Amino acid sequence: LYFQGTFAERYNIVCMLGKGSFGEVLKCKDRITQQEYAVKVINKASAKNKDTSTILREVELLKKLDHPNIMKLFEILEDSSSFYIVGELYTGGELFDEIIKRKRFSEHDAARIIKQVFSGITYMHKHNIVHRDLKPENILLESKEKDCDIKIIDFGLSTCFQQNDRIGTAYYIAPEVLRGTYDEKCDVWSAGVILYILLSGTPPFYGKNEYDILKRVETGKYAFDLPQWRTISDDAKDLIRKMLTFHPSLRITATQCLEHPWIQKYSSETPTISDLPSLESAMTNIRQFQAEKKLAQAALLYMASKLTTLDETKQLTEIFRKLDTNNDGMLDRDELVRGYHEFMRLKGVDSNSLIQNEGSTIEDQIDSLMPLLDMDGSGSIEYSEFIASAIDRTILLSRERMERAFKMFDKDGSGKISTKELEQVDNNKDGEVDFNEFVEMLQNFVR
Numbered sequence: 001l002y003f004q005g006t007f008a009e010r011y012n013i014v015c016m017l018g019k020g021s022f023g024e025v026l027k028c029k030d031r032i033t034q035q036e037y038a039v040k041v042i043n044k045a046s047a048k049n050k051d052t053s054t055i056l057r058e059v060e061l062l063k064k065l066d067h068p069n070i071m072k073l074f075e076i077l078e079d080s081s082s083f084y085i086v087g088e089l090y091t092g093g094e095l096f097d098e099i100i101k102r103k104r105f106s107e108h109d110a111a112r113i114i115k116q117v118f119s120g121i122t123y124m125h126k127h128n129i130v131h132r133d134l135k136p137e138n139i140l141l142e143s144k145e146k147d148c149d150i151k152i153i154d155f156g157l158s159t160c161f162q163q164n165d166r167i168g169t170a171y172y173i174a175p176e177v178l179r180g181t182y183d184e185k186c187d188v189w190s191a192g193v194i195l196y197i198l199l200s201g202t203p204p205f206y207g208k209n210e211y212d213i214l215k216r217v218e219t220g221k222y223a224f225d226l227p228q229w230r231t232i233s234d235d236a237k238d239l240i241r242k243m244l245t246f247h248p249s250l251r252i253t254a255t256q257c258l259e260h261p262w263i264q265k266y267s268s269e270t271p272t273i274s275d276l277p278s279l280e281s282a283m284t285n286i287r288q289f290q291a292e293k294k295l296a297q298a299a300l301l302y303m304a305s306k307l308t309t310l311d312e313t314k315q316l317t318e319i320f321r322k323l324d325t326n327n328d329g330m331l332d333r334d335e336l337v338r339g340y341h342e343f344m345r346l347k348g349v350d351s352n353s354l355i356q357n358e359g360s361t362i363e364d365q366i367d368s369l370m371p372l373l374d375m376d377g378s379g380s381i382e383y384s385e386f387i388a389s390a391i392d393r394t395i396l397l398s399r400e401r402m403e404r405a406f407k408m409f410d411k412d413g414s415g416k417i418s419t420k421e422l423e424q425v426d427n428n429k430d431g432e433v434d435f436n437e438f439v440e441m442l443q444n445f446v447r
């Protein structure tokens with residue numbers, strides 16, 4: 001293991017993507033799977049503001065964030081000079097450029113975008129994370145596909161690392177930030193500035209230079225005076241007023257943003273007849289997952305949450321969204337119950353008849369499933385738990401994906417897994433699992 005580095009053994013660097021946020025962002029490629037990722041490279045000696053143990057602890061919390069509108073981080077690796085934070089690669093660019101292209105958005109299109117921002121920030125705040133610098137430049141489009149998910153990026157590292165003059169940041173900061181305070185309410189203000197911009201195409205606190213912009217922000221004074229505001233609904237203006245309330249104690253919370261009537265009016269996404277092949281696929285797979293042993297169940301969640309790409313989960317992602325009726329990015333018990341009933345209704349099948357055919361009602365079925373699906377016991381089914389349980393068990397098992405999952409466990413690199421490193425089947429009887437027996441082990445879970 002002497003001539004093998006953690007990052008360098010696993011990943012090849014392809015090209016530079018960006019510079020600035022504590023370090024450079026590169027595209028990299030997994031040498032086994034050929035899957036592409038973004039990696040942020042942070043210099044240890046220049047940038048560290050805390051011991052490595054603190055940094056690894058806080059980055060681990062960031063890795064556990066599991067929400068469809070928050071940057072997915074897979075790992076943090078290190079060599080003698082750097083930290084390498086490896087994450088999902090998004091290819092649709094900054095929301096900022098979508099503002100430039102479109103100039104401004106209909107209420108419908110604005111609601112769909114800002115709803116995702118609200119859902120993401122809500123989840124962040126529930127996990128005691130404040131963004132601090134929320135703006136369209138730190139929100140990325142997942143891909144170039146129409147109405148793809150947005151992804152909040154570039155937060156969470158500010159206590160750990162020290163940074164090295166970017167245009168337009170002044171537009172988004174809450175007045176209390178000028179007094180040296182960043183709290184959860186400052187994220188709500190920034191989001192409201194974004195929404196003001198989506199609907200009108202112009203910042204609420206505007207000027208030709210940073211001096212004049214900050215003067216207006218300080219007063220908290222804005223108006224809906226521009227001509228374009230006369231054809232925007234009172235409901236949208238009500239939300240904005242609630243978000244750009246001067247005193248943070250009177251300003252609404254992110255959850256209140258997410259729950260606002262104007263948001264709910266433009267989030268009617270729900271299972272239709274076209275979704276039935278997709279729902280039936282998901283239900284078959286989740287039922288199999290329920291029947292599988294917890295060792296199988298745990299091992300599949302690891303594989304799905306780390307080694308799958310966007311194209312593969314895009315289908316399950318749309319279903320997830322249609323089941324997520326409160327738009328918070330996770331599925332609760334009642335959402336799964338309502339989703340099952342709706343699946344039956346759309347299919348032409350009476351749910352009262354499940355008590356004789358299968359032996360129990362939809363509610364009893366979901367209630368028995370929850371403890372098996374909610375593996376971290378969070379009270380909800382987050383995205384990766386859903387994907388783990390609903391994806392085709394076969395697609396998860398390309399040889400390349402099993403190889404990588406094997407290398408993650410074989411921590412001493414001897415060619416064979418043992419105990420602690422993660423029951424064993426063992427055909428040759430050495431008390432260890434080489435790769436070929438691992439491949440059977442995982443292909444026995446699938447059975």
Ligand SMILES: Nc1ncnc2c1c(Cc1cccc3ccccc13)nn2CC1CCNCC1
Pocket residue numbers: 017018019025038039040071073085086087088089090091094137140153154155
């Ligand atoms: N995910 C991404 N995908 C593509 N390009 C990205 C990123 C990321 C974010 C990112 C990548 C990898 C690890 C991370 C760890 C902590 C926080 C953020 C991370 N930056 N950039 C480059 C572009 C340049 C143009 N301005 C917008 C960003």
Ligand SMILES: [Ca+2]
Pocket residue numbers: 323324325326327328329330331332335
């Ligand atoms: Ca939900």
Ligand SMILES: [Ca+2]
Pocket residue numbers: 373374375376377378379380381382385
């Ligand atoms: Ca959970």
Ligand SMILES: [Ca+2]
Pocket residue numbers: 410411412413414415416417418
């Ligand atoms: Ca080994």
Ligand SMILES: [Ca+2]
Pocket residue numbers: 426427428429430431432433434437
């Ligand atoms: Ca063996």
